[PDB]
Coordinates of C-alpha atoms in Angstrom, one line a residue:
Chain A
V1 CA 147.3 -167.2 14.3
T2 CA 148.4 -168.5 17.7
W3 CA 151.4 -167.4 19.7
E4 CA 153.0 -170.7 18.9
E5 CA 152.9 -169.9 15.2
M6 CA 154.6 -166.6 15.5
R7 CA 157.1 -168.1 17.9
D8 CA 157.9 -170.8 15.3
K9 CA 158.1 -168.1 12.6
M10 CA 160.5 -166.1 14.8
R11 CA 162.6 -169.2 15.4
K12 CA 162.9 -169.8 11.6
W13 CA 163.6 -166.2 11.0
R14 CA 166.4 -166.4 13.6
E15 CA 167.9 -169.7 12.4
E16 CA 168.6 -168.2 9.0
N17 CA 170.0 -164.7 9.5
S18 CA 167.3 -162.5 8.0
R19 CA 167.2 -158.7 8.1
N20 CA 163.6 -157.9 7.4
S21 CA 163.7 -155.7 10.5
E22 CA 160.2 -154.3 10.2
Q23 CA 158.4 -157.7 10.1
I24 CA 160.6 -159.3 12.8
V25 CA 160.3 -156.2 15.1
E26 CA 156.5 -156.2 14.7
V27 CA 156.2 -159.9 15.5
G28 CA 158.5 -159.5 18.4
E29 CA 156.7 -156.6 19.8
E30 CA 153.4 -158.5 19.6
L31 CA 155.0 -161.5 21.3
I32 CA 156.5 -159.5 24.1
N33 CA 153.3 -157.4 24.7
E34 CA 150.5 -159.9 24.3
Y35 CA 152.1 -163.4 24.9
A36 CA 155.1 -162.4 27.0
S37 CA 154.1 -164.8 29.8
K38 CA 152.5 -167.4 27.6
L39 CA 155.9 -169.1 27.3
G40 CA 159.1 -169.3 29.4
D41 CA 162.7 -168.2 28.9
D42 CA 162.4 -168.9 25.1
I43 CA 161.4 -165.2 24.6
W44 CA 164.7 -164.1 26.1
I45 CA 166.7 -164.9 22.9
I46 CA 163.8 -163.0 21.2
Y47 CA 164.7 -160.0 23.3
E48 CA 168.0 -160.0 21.5
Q49 CA 166.6 -159.9 18.0
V50 CA 163.8 -157.5 19.0
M51 CA 166.3 -154.8 19.9
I52 CA 168.7 -155.5 17.0
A53 CA 165.7 -155.1 14.7
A54 CA 164.9 -151.9 16.5
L55 CA 168.4 -150.6 15.9
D56 CA 167.8 -151.7 12.3
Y57 CA 164.3 -150.3 12.3
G58 CA 165.3 -147.1 14.0
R59 CA 162.5 -147.4 16.6
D60 CA 164.7 -146.8 19.6
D61 CA 161.9 -146.6 22.1
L62 CA 161.7 -150.3 22.9
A63 CA 165.5 -150.8 22.5
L64 CA 165.9 -149.2 26.0
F65 CA 163.1 -151.4 27.4
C66 CA 164.7 -154.6 26.1
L67 CA 168.2 -153.5 27.1
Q68 CA 167.1 -152.6 30.7
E69 CA 165.2 -155.9 31.1
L70 CA 168.2 -157.9 29.9
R71 CA 170.7 -155.9 32.1
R72 CA 168.5 -156.2 35.2
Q73 CA 168.2 -159.9 34.5
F74 CA 171.8 -160.6 33.5
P75 CA 174.2 -158.3 35.3
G76 CA 177.8 -158.5 34.1
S77 CA 177.1 -160.6 31.1
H78 CA 179.4 -160.4 28.1
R79 CA 176.5 -161.0 25.6
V80 CA 174.5 -158.2 27.2
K81 CA 177.7 -156.1 27.2
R82 CA 178.0 -156.5 23.4
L83 CA 174.3 -155.8 23.1
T84 CA 174.8 -152.5 25.0
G85 CA 177.7 -151.8 22.7
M86 CA 175.4 -152.2 19.7
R87 CA 172.9 -149.9 21.4
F88 CA 175.7 -147.3 21.8
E89 CA 176.8 -147.7 18.1
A90 CA 173.2 -147.1 17.0
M91 CA 173.8 -143.4 17.6
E92 CA 177.4 -143.5 16.3
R93 CA 178.7 -143.3 19.9
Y94 CA 182.0 -145.0 19.1
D95 CA 184.5 -144.0 21.8
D96 CA 182.3 -145.4 24.7
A97 CA 181.6 -148.5 22.7
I98 CA 185.3 -149.1 22.0
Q99 CA 186.1 -148.6 25.7
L100 CA 183.3 -151.1 26.6
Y101 CA 184.6 -153.7 24.2
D102 CA 188.2 -153.2 25.5
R103 CA 186.8 -153.7 29.0
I104 CA 185.1 -156.9 27.8
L105 CA 188.3 -158.1 26.2
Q106 CA 190.4 -157.4 29.3
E107 CA 187.8 -159.2 31.4
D108 CA 187.7 -162.2 29.0
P109 CA 190.3 -162.6 26.2
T110 CA 188.8 -165.6 24.5
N111 CA 185.5 -163.7 23.7
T112 CA 185.0 -163.3 19.9
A113 CA 182.0 -161.0 19.9
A114 CA 184.0 -157.9 21.0
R115 CA 186.5 -158.1 18.2
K116 CA 183.7 -158.5 15.6
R117 CA 181.8 -155.6 17.0
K118 CA 185.0 -153.3 17.1
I119 CA 185.8 -154.2 13.5
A120 CA 182.2 -153.5 12.6
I121 CA 182.7 -150.1 14.2
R122 CA 185.9 -149.5 12.2
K123 CA 184.1 -150.5 8.9
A124 CA 181.2 -148.2 9.9
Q125 CA 183.7 -145.3 10.3
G126 CA 184.9 -145.9 6.7
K127 CA 188.4 -147.0 7.6
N128 CA 188.3 -150.0 5.2
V129 CA 192.0 -150.6 5.1
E130 CA 192.3 -150.7 8.9
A131 CA 189.2 -152.9 9.1
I132 CA 190.7 -155.4 6.7
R133 CA 194.0 -155.3 8.7
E134 CA 192.1 -155.9 11.9
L135 CA 190.2 -158.9 10.4
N136 CA 193.4 -160.3 9.1
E137 CA 194.9 -160.0 12.6
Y138 CA 191.8 -161.5 14.2
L139 CA 191.8 -164.5 12.0
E140 CA 195.4 -165.2 12.9
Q141 CA 194.0 -166.4 16.3
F142 CA 190.7 -167.7 15.1
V143 CA 191.3 -169.5 11.8
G144 CA 188.1 -171.4 10.9
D145 CA 185.4 -168.8 11.7
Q146 CA 183.2 -169.1 8.7
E147 CA 181.2 -165.9 9.3
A148 CA 184.3 -163.7 9.6
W149 CA 185.8 -165.5 6.6
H150 CA 182.8 -164.7 4.4
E151 CA 182.8 -161.1 5.8
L152 CA 186.4 -160.6 4.9
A153 CA 185.7 -162.0 1.4
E154 CA 182.8 -159.6 1.0
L155 CA 185.0 -156.7 2.2
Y156 CA 187.7 -157.6 -0.3
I157 CA 185.1 -157.9 -3.1
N158 CA 183.9 -154.4 -2.2
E159 CA 187.5 -153.0 -2.2
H160 CA 188.1 -155.1 -5.4
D161 CA 191.1 -157.2 -4.4
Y162 CA 189.5 -160.2 -6.1
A163 CA 192.5 -162.5 -5.6
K164 CA 192.2 -162.3 -1.8
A165 CA 188.5 -162.7 -2.0
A166 CA 188.8 -165.7 -4.3
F167 CA 191.3 -167.2 -1.8
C168 CA 189.0 -166.7 1.1
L169 CA 186.1 -168.2 -0.8
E170 CA 188.3 -171.2 -1.7
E171 CA 189.0 -171.8 2.0
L172 CA 185.4 -171.3 2.8
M173 CA 184.5 -174.0 0.4
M174 CA 187.2 -176.0 2.1
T175 CA 185.1 -175.5 5.3
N176 CA 181.7 -176.2 3.7
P177 CA 181.8 -178.4 0.5
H178 CA 178.1 -178.9 0.4
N179 CA 176.9 -175.3 0.2
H180 CA 176.2 -174.3 -3.4
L181 CA 176.0 -170.6 -2.6
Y182 CA 179.7 -170.5 -1.8
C183 CA 180.4 -172.3 -5.1
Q184 CA 178.3 -169.8 -7.1
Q185 CA 179.9 -166.8 -5.4
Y186 CA 183.4 -168.1 -6.0
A187 CA 182.6 -168.8 -9.6
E188 CA 181.4 -165.2 -9.9
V189 CA 184.5 -163.8 -8.2
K190 CA 186.8 -165.9 -10.4
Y191 CA 185.1 -164.9 -13.5
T192 CA 185.4 -161.2 -12.5
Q193 CA 189.0 -161.7 -11.6
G194 CA 190.5 -162.4 -14.9
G195 CA 190.5 -164.3 -18.2
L196 CA 190.6 -167.8 -19.6
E197 CA 193.0 -169.1 -16.9
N198 CA 190.2 -168.0 -14.4
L199 CA 187.3 -168.5 -16.8
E200 CA 187.9 -172.2 -16.8
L201 CA 187.8 -172.3 -13.0
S202 CA 184.7 -170.2 -13.0
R203 CA 182.9 -172.5 -15.5
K204 CA 184.0 -175.6 -13.5
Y205 CA 182.7 -174.2 -10.3
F206 CA 179.4 -173.0 -11.9
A207 CA 179.0 -176.6 -13.1
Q208 CA 179.7 -177.8 -9.6
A209 CA 177.1 -175.5 -8.2
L210 CA 174.6 -176.7 -10.7
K211 CA 175.4 -180.3 -9.7
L212 CA 174.9 -179.4 -6.1
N213 CA 171.6 -177.7 -6.8
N214 CA 169.7 -177.8 -10.1
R215 CA 167.5 -174.8 -9.1
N216 CA 170.4 -172.2 -9.0
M217 CA 169.5 -170.9 -12.4
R218 CA 171.6 -167.8 -11.6
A219 CA 174.7 -170.0 -11.7
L220 CA 173.1 -171.8 -14.7
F221 CA 173.2 -168.8 -17.0
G222 CA 176.4 -167.7 -15.3
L223 CA 178.0 -170.9 -16.6
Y224 CA 176.3 -170.2 -20.0
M225 CA 177.8 -166.7 -20.2
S226 CA 181.2 -167.9 -19.0
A227 CA 181.2 -170.6 -21.8
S228 CA 180.2 -167.9 -24.3
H229 CA 183.0 -165.6 -23.2
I230 CA 185.5 -168.5 -23.5
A231 CA 184.1 -169.2 -27.0
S232 CA 184.5 -165.5 -28.1
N233 CA 188.1 -165.4 -26.8
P234 CA 190.6 -165.9 -29.6
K235 CA 193.1 -167.5 -27.3
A236 CA 190.8 -170.6 -26.9
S237 CA 192.1 -173.7 -28.6
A238 CA 190.0 -175.5 -31.2
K239 CA 189.3 -178.4 -28.9
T240 CA 188.5 -175.9 -26.1
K241 CA 186.4 -173.9 -28.6
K242 CA 184.2 -176.8 -29.5
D243 CA 184.0 -178.0 -25.9
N244 CA 182.8 -174.6 -24.7
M245 CA 180.4 -174.4 -27.6
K246 CA 178.9 -177.7 -26.6
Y247 CA 178.7 -176.4 -23.0
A248 CA 177.0 -173.2 -24.2
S249 CA 174.5 -175.1 -26.3
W250 CA 173.6 -177.4 -23.4
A251 CA 173.3 -174.4 -21.1
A252 CA 171.1 -172.6 -23.7
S253 CA 168.9 -175.7 -23.9
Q254 CA 168.6 -175.8 -20.1
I255 CA 167.7 -172.1 -20.1
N256 CA 165.0 -172.5 -22.6
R257 CA 163.6 -175.5 -20.6
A258 CA 163.8 -173.4 -17.3
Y259 CA 162.0 -170.5 -18.9
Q260 CA 159.4 -172.8 -20.3
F261 CA 158.8 -174.1 -16.8
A262 CA 158.6 -170.5 -15.6
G263 CA 156.0 -170.2 -18.3
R264 CA 153.8 -173.1 -17.3
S265 CA 153.9 -172.1 -13.6
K266 CA 152.5 -168.6 -14.1
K267 CA 149.8 -167.1 -16.4
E268 CA 150.7 -163.8 -18.1
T269 CA 152.5 -162.4 -21.2
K270 CA 155.4 -164.5 -22.4
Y271 CA 158.3 -162.4 -21.2
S272 CA 160.2 -165.7 -20.7
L273 CA 159.8 -166.1 -24.5
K274 CA 161.3 -162.6 -24.8
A275 CA 163.9 -163.9 -22.4
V276 CA 164.8 -166.9 -24.6
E277 CA 164.7 -164.4 -27.5
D278 CA 167.9 -163.1 -25.8
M279 CA 169.4 -166.6 -25.8
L280 CA 168.8 -167.1 -29.5
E281 CA 170.8 -163.9 -30.1
Chain B
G1 CA 170.1 -132.1 -19.0
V2 CA 168.8 -135.2 -17.3
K3 CA 165.1 -135.7 -16.8
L4 CA 163.4 -138.6 -15.1
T5 CA 159.7 -139.4 -14.4
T6 CA 158.0 -139.3 -11.1
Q7 CA 157.5 -143.1 -11.3
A8 CA 161.3 -143.4 -11.6
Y9 CA 161.6 -141.5 -8.2
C10 CA 159.0 -143.6 -6.5
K11 CA 160.8 -146.7 -7.8
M12 CA 164.0 -145.3 -6.4
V13 CA 162.4 -144.8 -2.9
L14 CA 160.7 -148.3 -3.1
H15 CA 164.0 -150.1 -3.9
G16 CA 165.8 -148.0 -1.2
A17 CA 163.2 -149.1 1.4
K18 CA 163.1 -152.7 0.3
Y19 CA 166.8 -153.3 1.2
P20 CA 167.7 -150.4 3.6
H21 CA 170.9 -152.1 4.9
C22 CA 172.3 -153.1 1.5
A23 CA 173.6 -151.0 -1.3
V24 CA 171.6 -151.3 -4.5
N25 CA 171.8 -150.4 -8.1
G26 CA 170.0 -150.6 -11.4
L27 CA 169.1 -149.0 -14.7
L28 CA 166.8 -146.4 -16.2
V29 CA 165.3 -146.9 -19.7
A30 CA 164.1 -144.2 -22.0
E31 CA 162.8 -143.9 -25.6
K32 CA 165.0 -142.8 -28.4
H33 CA 167.2 -133.2 -21.7
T34 CA 166.4 -136.9 -22.1
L35 CA 163.3 -138.2 -20.4
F36 CA 163.8 -141.4 -18.4
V37 CA 160.4 -143.0 -19.1
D38 CA 160.9 -146.1 -17.0
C39 CA 163.3 -147.8 -14.5
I40 CA 164.4 -151.3 -13.4
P41 CA 166.3 -152.5 -10.3
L42 CA 168.9 -155.2 -10.1
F43 CA 170.7 -156.9 -7.1
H44 CA 171.7 -155.6 -3.7
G45 CA 174.3 -156.1 -1.1
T46 CA 177.4 -157.2 -3.0
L47 CA 177.7 -155.1 -6.2
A48 CA 181.3 -155.5 -7.4
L49 CA 180.5 -158.9 -9.1
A50 CA 180.7 -158.7 -12.9
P51 CA 178.7 -161.7 -14.2
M52 CA 175.4 -160.6 -12.7
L53 CA 175.9 -157.1 -14.0
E54 CA 176.6 -158.4 -17.5
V55 CA 173.7 -160.8 -17.6
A56 CA 171.5 -158.0 -16.3
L57 CA 172.5 -155.4 -18.8
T58 CA 172.0 -157.9 -21.6
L59 CA 168.5 -158.7 -20.4
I60 CA 167.7 -155.0 -20.0
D61 CA 168.9 -154.3 -23.5
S62 CA 166.8 -157.2 -24.9
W63 CA 163.6 -156.3 -23.1
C64 CA 164.0 -152.6 -24.0
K65 CA 164.7 -153.0 -27.7
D66 CA 161.9 -155.5 -28.0
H67 CA 159.5 -152.8 -26.7
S68 CA 161.2 -149.7 -28.3
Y69 CA 162.9 -148.4 -25.2
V70 CA 166.7 -148.0 -24.7
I71 CA 168.7 -148.1 -21.5
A72 CA 169.9 -144.5 -20.8
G73 CA 170.8 -144.2 -17.1
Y74 CA 172.4 -146.0 -14.2
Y75 CA 171.4 -145.6 -10.5
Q76 CA 173.2 -146.8 -7.4
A77 CA 172.5 -146.2 -3.7
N78 CA 175.4 -146.8 -1.4
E79 CA 175.3 -148.5 2.0
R80 CA 177.1 -146.0 4.2
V81 CA 175.1 -143.0 5.4
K82 CA 178.1 -140.6 5.1
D83 CA 179.0 -141.9 1.6
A84 CA 177.8 -139.9 -1.4
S85 CA 180.6 -140.4 -4.0
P86 CA 180.5 -143.1 -6.7
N87 CA 182.6 -146.2 -6.3
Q88 CA 184.5 -148.0 -9.0
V89 CA 181.5 -150.2 -10.0
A90 CA 179.2 -147.2 -10.5
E91 CA 181.9 -145.3 -12.5
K92 CA 182.7 -148.2 -14.8
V93 CA 179.1 -149.1 -15.4
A94 CA 178.1 -145.5 -16.1
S95 CA 181.1 -145.2 -18.5
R96 CA 180.1 -148.4 -20.3
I97 CA 176.4 -147.5 -20.7
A98 CA 177.3 -144.0 -21.7
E99 CA 179.4 -145.4 -24.6
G100 CA 176.2 -146.0 -26.5
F101 CA 174.5 -142.6 -26.0
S102 CA 176.3 -139.5 -24.7
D103 CA 173.2 -138.3 -23.0
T104 CA 173.4 -141.1 -20.4
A105 CA 174.4 -139.7 -17.0
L106 CA 174.7 -141.4 -13.7
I107 CA 172.4 -140.9 -10.7
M108 CA 173.0 -141.8 -7.1
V109 CA 170.4 -141.9 -4.3
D110 CA 171.9 -139.8 -1.5
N111 CA 170.8 -141.8 1.5
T112 CA 171.5 -139.0 3.9
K113 CA 168.4 -137.1 2.7
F114 CA 166.3 -140.3 2.6
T115 CA 163.1 -139.6 4.7
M116 CA 159.5 -140.7 4.9
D117 CA 158.2 -137.9 2.6
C118 CA 161.4 -137.2 0.7
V119 CA 161.4 -133.6 1.5
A120 CA 164.4 -132.8 -0.7
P121 CA 165.4 -134.5 -3.9
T122 CA 167.6 -137.5 -2.8
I123 CA 168.9 -138.3 -6.3
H124 CA 172.1 -136.5 -7.4
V125 CA 172.9 -136.6 -11.1
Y126 CA 176.5 -136.8 -12.3
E127 CA 177.7 -136.0 -15.8
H128 CA 180.7 -137.2 -17.7
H129 CA 182.8 -134.4 -19.2
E130 CA 186.5 -133.9 -19.8
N131 CA 186.8 -137.7 -19.1
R132 CA 185.7 -137.1 -15.5
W133 CA 182.4 -137.7 -13.6
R134 CA 181.1 -134.8 -11.6
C135 CA 177.8 -133.8 -10.0
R136 CA 175.3 -131.4 -11.5
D137 CA 173.7 -128.4 -9.8
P138 CA 171.9 -129.7 -6.7
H139 CA 169.5 -126.7 -6.9
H140 CA 168.2 -127.9 -10.3
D141 CA 164.8 -129.4 -10.5
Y142 CA 165.0 -133.2 -11.0
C143 CA 161.5 -134.7 -10.9
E144 CA 158.8 -133.6 -13.3
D145 CA 156.1 -133.2 -10.6
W146 CA 157.8 -132.8 -7.2
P147 CA 154.7 -132.6 -5.0
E148 CA 153.3 -135.6 -7.0
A149 CA 156.5 -137.5 -6.4
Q150 CA 156.4 -136.6 -2.7
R151 CA 152.8 -137.7 -2.2
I152 CA 153.1 -141.0 -4.2
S153 CA 156.3 -142.0 -2.4
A154 CA 154.7 -141.2 1.0
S155 CA 151.6 -143.2 0.1
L156 CA 153.6 -146.2 -1.3
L157 CA 155.9 -146.3 1.7
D158 CA 153.0 -146.0 4.2
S159 CA 151.0 -148.7 2.3
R160 CA 153.9 -151.2 2.9
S161 CA 154.3 -151.7 -0.9
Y162 CA 158.1 -151.8 -0.6
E163 CA 157.9 -155.4 0.7
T164 CA 155.9 -156.4 -2.4
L165 CA 158.4 -154.7 -4.8
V166 CA 160.6 -157.2 -6.8
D167 CA 163.9 -156.4 -8.3
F168 CA 166.1 -158.5 -10.7
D169 CA 167.6 -160.4 -7.8
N170 CA 164.3 -161.9 -6.8
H171 CA 163.7 -162.8 -10.4
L172 CA 167.1 -164.7 -10.2
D173 CA 165.8 -166.4 -7.1
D174 CA 162.6 -167.3 -8.9
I175 CA 161.2 -166.3 -12.2
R176 CA 157.7 -166.5 -10.7
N177 CA 158.5 -163.1 -9.2
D178 CA 157.9 -160.6 -12.0
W179 CA 161.1 -158.6 -12.6
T180 CA 159.1 -156.1 -14.8
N181 CA 157.2 -155.4 -11.6
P182 CA 154.0 -153.9 -13.3
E183 CA 152.3 -154.1 -9.9
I184 CA 154.0 -150.9 -8.7
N185 CA 153.2 -149.4 -12.1
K186 CA 149.4 -150.1 -11.6
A187 CA 149.7 -148.7 -8.1
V188 CA 151.3 -145.6 -9.4
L189 CA 148.5 -145.3 -12.0
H190 CA 145.8 -145.7 -9.4
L191 CA 147.4 -143.2 -7.0
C192 CA 147.8 -140.6 -9.8
Chain C
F1 CA 179.6 -158.9 -26.0
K2 CA 178.2 -155.4 -25.7
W3 CA 178.1 -155.5 -21.8
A4 CA 181.4 -157.2 -21.0
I5 CA 182.3 -154.9 -18.1
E6 CA 185.6 -155.4 -16.2
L7 CA 185.6 -154.8 -12.5
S8 CA 189.2 -155.8 -11.7
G9 CA 192.1 -153.4 -11.5
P10 CA 193.8 -152.0 -8.3
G11 CA 194.7 -154.5 -5.6
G12 CA 195.3 -151.8 -3.0
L13 CA 199.2 -157.5 6.7
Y14 CA 198.4 -160.0 4.1
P15 CA 195.4 -162.3 4.9
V16 CA 196.5 -165.4 6.7
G17 CA 196.9 -168.4 4.4
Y18 CA 197.6 -166.2 1.4
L19 CA 200.8 -166.5 -0.6
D20 CA 201.1 -164.4 -3.8
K21 CA 203.8 -166.3 -5.6
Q22 CA 202.6 -169.2 -7.7
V23 CA 204.8 -172.0 -6.5
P24 CA 205.2 -175.2 -8.5
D25 CA 206.0 -177.4 -5.5
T26 CA 204.4 -180.8 -5.9

């Protein structure tokens, strides 16, 4: 347990956007208290996460410390300005945060952080419709922002306009063909959206996600259940009926195999057997 | 007439603490004034997706009927602090689960009252009558042993047991994580 | 299926790139 090890752990926990605020805030506090001078400016990015975790963790005592250090180091910085905006939003102080973001925008119009923070404020206030409208307007100038695209898709899913969410996930897959998570989420959204005309797309995209990653057993039994629903639908044609029955049988075989592997990996009561007891039904 | 065990409340607090930033949901199973003997969590964050909910409910029904329980309640904790009313997902899920047994009623973890010790009962129980869902009396007693629930929730949260808690979503990530989470059950037994 | 819950229903400017009408142009 050396400061390099926790530094690498924090770097990994930053590269993939985790939100285990307690662990990251504890590690960051240890780093900035014990090994603050053991390494150079690489802690400064840490000083971002550490405060955000604090706002997530509720421990506001060190949020002021980190903010004051960053401000005294970086006067008139748009990143630190957004960070102050988040500090203000931590206590639902929305008017001052909005004014600060407007000042940032009038100082620099190409900044994208201020728009995202202001729409985060709007969605925190519960005005979902105006938040969706603001995101739609913001994308009209910044088509291609994958993060905002996925956030808009998630908001549409929450508000249950599954057509727009499916469209946004389609264009997200356009952006990133090789991410199986997007394919799985789009298959789920399409399955939830409607019937056979969308069930076919859902099962095709579930198969695509399985091809892109064999371990996504979530999408595995998602494909299984989509095929089963297609089978149970009277409108399915005879050739479609036998095709989806074959797909369901293959998926069931894969599910029994996967749960047998789950069995050999652990050592306990055979709940996985109970699990395939469900498949036999 | 909705009654849930103290372990159900501690599981509620555990799942709320595991993913504080994401809205969560799940089911509560009971044997055939109904007493919710046990509970089970499922997913977090995005909750409007159907396929996971369907596969979940099917697995809950299989596991419960294999071991004589039946699913009899639905819980959902929303993301927003100032939000305490059910959404479409919660309403439809509660209506569908209530189709089997009329005694099934919805419960929602009011995150506004979520504290370290859980001074006041966070859960609010909603009943379906006249084809409408409406809350019960807040002044009613909800847990079977309120001081016991308070102390066990405080001990579990202070023991950092929420990180070890596993819901259905982690089972989906990897089956090696036990979705039946008997670990919190043995911790409850040891604490009691 | 005893758990076939439907989550669709009410659909509420329009998101950029969206076009509701199913056009057969090819």
